[PDB]
Design a protein around this ligand. Structure first.
Ligand SMILES: O=C[C@H](O)[C@@H](O)[C@H](O)[C@H](O)C(=O)O
Lengths: 809, 811
């Protein structure tokens, strides 16, 4: 695989040495596609080493790069210069051989030689070299830097990716408004995708070793909007197709724009016009490799359409229909129809369910279909049950798992990926393309090596593992539920599931942020696009909805903590906006402005009908300073853990106030009678609980601050007991001193941990009462009550004394 | 309070206008301390505006700053001219008045005037002006940037911090090796703390408005190592003391270093030498404001004190009461005092916290009349039982406040001295401590957090204050739970999710600190790292290390090869701990703080750091983890059994297929699928062994498979699920997952978007003699990916992740 190294070494070809690149020889007979690729190679080398290689007029230099395409005597001489068997490329599809060859031809001492079995092979060779020299396919589309190199040497040996397993390997730009469309407008000034735009797309497809494109078709018409569109793709070597409901090489919008003139999209009543519309599509794609969509939705009718479309193809081409590549999509009713006559030569394009699951795969008879089978796969969708157009939400595993299946069932003629706006599907696109190239090189053991190599490529070797880990995780997390379908109820609040997934995503963000700040500066934009932004956007969205669910829970409980969670919803909502603003406007100098504007907060339907991202509903407790006391707890799972601030009522001693010390202690806060200069006589603080009826004993754990015996050598006491029962008086610190028996056995162990936990076994006075009241009475000043746990079988020893039990006030 | 503003305004004094600072006049009569402070003021102004104010030779400039100290004739003349009453300062302690004054003296049209009741007051005035112009006390000690200003104006009015509530307000550099000691050696090129180092310390103390210092005494001797030490402190205006075990103004090391000559630290047998050692301490500190530690059976201790005070009188030719003295009551001594030990009236009785921020003893109402007053020695760093805390700040904001307010309310107001360890990273507690000692009654529970908020505003700017304060408060609280040294895999409860909770929560805090960090203007990054980010990251990571270690041990005991991942995480976090500290030491602030963050903190088995180095916590790895598959047995708890599909007991593949784990596949752990999908599944099964309570006769089993569709056969995919000893229930999980009108919107699209298919099967539990059940999943069609099973017998709660996996072990 890896033939480029970045240090000089003997019997290694010096492609760049001491900053100086060798020149490039392309024979002038080569297709313009090869030339375009060679030109990009030149530029890539310039990016790599700082000097532009010369494009040689003739076979004259000691060391150079030679690229060309099988079928030429120049290339024959070169293949027997040396020792490359014709059978390595003869009749092969989209294959290159890359090899350092000594004395390749008279006037050249040594060359790295790239020979394609056809022009795309040659292109793929060229781009393989470009890629291995450190120009990612994503150098432009995700601002992946080209690491500068003084030296670039090529290993001896013969290098090939072989032939692609899947014949046509493509993306479909779709769901393209508003992001791609406004981005294109912003970047190119055009209210359509013009050839400058499609030149970038096509360069990307080819660098990814794809060869196929369904252009954007919502409001654009690839063939019609810019007469250079087709020529650009075609000369670069990208095969163009149309989506499954765009027959006969016409873009949907060519009809829609002239609907009043064309009239009805109905074959039974408007056939002459539709046939002619069709005919013109075929005429226009003659001379190209484009694949012709057949069929039509306005069974004997559909066959007649297809019969007629194929006649039209024959009339236009003066060739049998079989010689024009065709695809018939088995998209909906049509699949039912098929379960109908389809000619042998036609690619039967099967569809996923729009969510990455294949619906139908051919059986063993079906697989004998000479035209082959296709798969149209989604990583972006607008439709039921809800649009997924925001972030990548395709788990790496799921794409792999269904594509391996797809290939194993003999679907190998055509793979086409709905990529939405292209960004931010950069990774799945790459996986898709690599899998279409060679699905059998992938198995469960090595799957993650793919995102690993991708991350090595995008962010460097030293970042690959950790970036891959995060890429894999965010893809998984996002697979769970799309941002659009995520809301306050997706996850279970009461079980801790929501907190778990929210905390987990934030942990992933922390990690992504560590990685981000560790990057060399030139990787930051790519990492932001490919890793950090999706992670932060989703982690924050999670927290928003998590905080919302908490807000609602606590609001129903009349607990003024609801207000904090409301703040968090507002903050996260604002953060969502700041994150996208940064992606659009700041990142990459605003190169991707409008690529990240998809509405995602406010869906009440499958479609994003609603105007804009909108604040999830939250509630606030008015006068939260007064919303204190009145807490009643319901025991669950055998215990009641009570944060001391959640008292039912309290009564202060004279010249004192029960005071909440927020954050005090290990958990929520502390309650203390203040000031400490006053006796506490008659103060108490009471907690109301609901035990299951019948529980007759509890062990109450009382957690106070590790206050020491500062006022009175006897130490501090409080009493704890049920209303209606006997109060136990506990002296919680009389042993917290330096006396030999105490100093190591209890004193130092205790004080370093800042709390004192005392247990009181209490008899429940009447086990028939609905509520019990536990009352804490500080008998000495300076006692800070932090927590109580009423254990009736379920308490598990916990440093935080367990999650607070259910309550409401 | 705030008298500096940063725009021009009428009736406001232009201290800096147009980038140009007005000059400074200090009368020649002023103490050198004031001069030193005025010199720093000059520098500070230079930092702020870019131009160094002139130190005027004489009272000749239209506008200038004038600072001086009550009692000089120059200041006398100045106050009896518009319009400052003598009573505002006469006899006041460490007070300033700062006031714009018109025609303050012959030759000056207008001045901002700072008048201290004494030289420290003046100094504090000066530094108040520095601070309000934007020079934090932490400008050097935590690299807090000085926001440049073209214009700095002073509000009219009279400004004062009053008198400090607590007379002596100090820090104790302690536990100082290896960090402070090596940092000093590295920075000052000395093997001891010299006067240049102590000048920085003293500058910090004075800018914080403290006045007191117990210098580092482990391997250094402040008085002896550099003869300029004492002079420097003394002339700056910092009072020097020694720690409670260093009587009579001798540093402990002065004894230790001459222990052969000396020799026994025993008053009963080596009194002549010890008395002389003492006498020399008192001779040496004459001329200074230093406070003399006294003390050293009860009759013996009284005799020592009697003799120390005779020595003080002999040396000073004055009554002992005129020499400030402090006698620490900890341990036996406190009992002696209770038991009835006579302490002379003039002595400051220094009470001690428990080394962990809790006061041990406060004076009662009678005791509080002690004329010498009372002291509190408070710790935010400690080397001792039960275990050293000398790594990070671990003092919750609330705790320092809560005990210090108590301390003050009980009339302990002569002397507050804070053990600060290496000083860094206790920057915040030190500030809180100093501000509280200044004025404890300024603080209450309702405004407490405004203190760290102002601190964060000051250090990181206004726009960062709230969020930095929030993190500061939280990390301080989190650290208060348990010290890094005392934290280990057993601190938190693993089984309840507590460990995960606190680990995840700290990492969330780090995420937040990181957001904040990367939002900062670049000049704040070093200070924020020192003050917020590093402690947060260091602790969050430490938490994860120990959390991962606990998980490792749990899973290892279960013979579950997942243990290995957790082991990786322990190694990684261990390595991260090192990277974090390396950055603090070497990269942050250009390596200014090299060696300040080298404390050992991973490896404690006992109270002291007497182990060679931070060391990898013990982890265990399952050898041959690819073979450590199957053999899982689950124990139901809480009314359900949630089973990740990979955790099967046994499996049998169909011919030419292999049960294959697809890691990460699905919503939780992974997926199990018979591969490849080109083969019929005839006879394949995968079985899970569970322990139900024997009373259970029916369960609803939720079977979670990937939303695979009917790709091979229009009938769709089936599997069977059932108990060994019971009937296998066949479920067709996707026959309805198609575009047929009945299905397309009701079930098809709602299902596939969520990537899974959950089917419930009510199963009867067959009666087994073992109490064990085996539940068996049989894919009858290719391409089925089993992800999870939940066996619900009353406890299942509908959950998107189908609830935390139940307890299991294998083999
Ligand atoms: O914790 C402090 C160090 O262990 C000692 O040098 C110190 O002298 C004593 O333990 C103290 O804390 O005052």
């Amino acid at each position: 695989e890896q033939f480029v190294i970045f240090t000089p070494a003997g019997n290694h070809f010096p492609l760049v040495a001491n900053g100086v690149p060798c020149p490039i020889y392309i024979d002038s007979s080569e297709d313009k596609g090869v030339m375009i690729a060679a030109g990009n190679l030149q530029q890539d080398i310039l990016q790599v080493c700082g000097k532009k290689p010369e494009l040689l007029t003739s076979t004259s230099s000691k060391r150079c790069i030679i690229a060309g395409t099988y079928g030429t005597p120049f290339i024959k001489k070169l293949m027997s210069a040396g020792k490359i068997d014709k059978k390595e490329l003869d009749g092969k599809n989209e294959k290159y051989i890359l090899q350092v060859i000594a004395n390749p031809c008279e006037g050249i001492d040594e060359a790295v030689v790239i020979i394609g079995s056809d022009r795309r092979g040659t292109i793929y060779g060229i781009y393989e070299l470009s890629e291995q020299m450190g120009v990612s396919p994503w150098y432009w589309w995700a601002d992946v830097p080209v690491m500068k190199q003084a030296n670039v040497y090529i290993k001896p040996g013969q290098y090939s990716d072989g032939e692609p397993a899947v014949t046509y390997r493509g993306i479909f730009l779709n769901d393209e408004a508003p992001c791609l469309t406004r981005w294109v407008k912003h970047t190119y000034g055009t209210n359509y995708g013009d050839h400058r735009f499609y030149a970038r797309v096509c360069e990307l497809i080819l660098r990814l070793k794809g060869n196929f494109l369904w252009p954007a078709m919502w409001s654009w018409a690839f063939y019609a909007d810019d007469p250079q569109n087709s020529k650009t793709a075609s000369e670069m070597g990208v095969i163009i197709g149309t989506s499954h409901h765009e027959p006969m090489a016409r873009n949907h919008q060519e009809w829609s724009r002239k609907r009043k003139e064309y009239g009805a999209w109905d074959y039974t009543t408007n056939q002459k016009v539709i046939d002619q519309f069709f005919r013109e599509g075929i005429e226009r794609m003659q001379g190209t490799e484009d694949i012709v969509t057949i069929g039509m939705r306005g069974v004997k009718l559909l066959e007649n359409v297809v019969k007629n479309q194929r006649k039209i193809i024959e009339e236009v081409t003066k060739r049998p229909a079989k010689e024009t590549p065709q695809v018939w999509a088995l998209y909906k009713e049509v699949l039912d129809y098929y379960d109908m006559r389809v000619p042998d030569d036609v690619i039967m394009l099967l569809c996923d369910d729009n969510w990455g699951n294949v619906c139908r795969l051919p059986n063993a008879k079906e697989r004998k279909h000479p035209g082959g089978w296709g798969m149209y796969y989604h990583v972006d969708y607008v439709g039921a049950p809800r649009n997924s157009k925001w972030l990548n939400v395709t788990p790496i595993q799921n794409m792999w798992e269904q594509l391996q299946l797809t290939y194993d069932y003999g679907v190998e003629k055509l793979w086409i990926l709905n990529v939405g706006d292209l960004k931010p599907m950069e990774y799945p696109i790459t996986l898709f393309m690599d899998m279409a190239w060679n699905p059998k090189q992938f198995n469960v053991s090595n799957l993650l090596d793919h995102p690993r190599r991708f991350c090595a490529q995008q962010f460097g070797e030293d970042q690959a593992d950790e970036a891959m880990r995060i890429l894999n995780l965010y893809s998984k997390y996002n697979g769970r539920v799309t941002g659009e379908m995520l809301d306050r109820n997706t996850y279970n609040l009461e079980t801790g599931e929501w907190k778990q997934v929210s905390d987990e995503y934030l942990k992933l963000e922390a990690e992504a942020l560590r990685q981000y700040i560790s990057l060399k500066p030139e990787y930051k934009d790519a990492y932001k696009q490919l890793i950090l932004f999706p992670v932060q956007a989703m982690a924050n969205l999670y927290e928003m909805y998590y905080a919302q669910a908490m807000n609602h829970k606590l609001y129903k409980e009349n607990n003024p903590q609801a207000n904090e969670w409301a703040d968090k919803v507002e903050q996260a909502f604002a953060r969502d906006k700041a994150l996208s603003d940064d992606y659009n406007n700041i990142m990459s100098g605003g190169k991707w402005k409008n690529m990240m504007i998809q509405k995602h907060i406010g869906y009440t339907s499958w479609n994003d009908n609603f105007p804009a991202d909108t604040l999830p509903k939250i509630y606030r407790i008015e006068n939260p300073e007064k919303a204190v006391g009145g807490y009643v707890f319901t025991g669950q799972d055998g215990y009641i853990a009570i944060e001391a601030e959640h008292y039912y009522s309290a009564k202060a001693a004279p010249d004192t106030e029960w005071t909440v010390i927020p954050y005090m202690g290990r958990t929520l806060s502390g309650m203390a009678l203040m000031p400490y200069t006053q006796p506490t006589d008659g103060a108490s603080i009471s907690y109301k609980i609901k035990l299951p009826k019948g529980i007759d004993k509890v062990t109450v754990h009382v957690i106070v601050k590790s206050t020491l015996a500062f006022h009175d050598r006897k130490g501090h006491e409080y009493s704890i007991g049920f209303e209606g029962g006997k109060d136990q008086t506990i002296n919680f610190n009389h042993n917290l001193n330096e006396l030999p028996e105490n100093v190591y056995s209890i004193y130092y162990p205790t004080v370093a941990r800042r709390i004192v936990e005392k247990k009181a076994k209490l008899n429940v006075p009447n086990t028939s009462d609905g509520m019990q009241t536990i009352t804490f009475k500080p008998l000495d000043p300076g006692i800070v009550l932090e927590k109580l746990v009423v254990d009736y079988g379920g308490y598990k020893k916990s440093y935080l004394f367990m999650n607070e039990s259910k309550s409401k006030r």
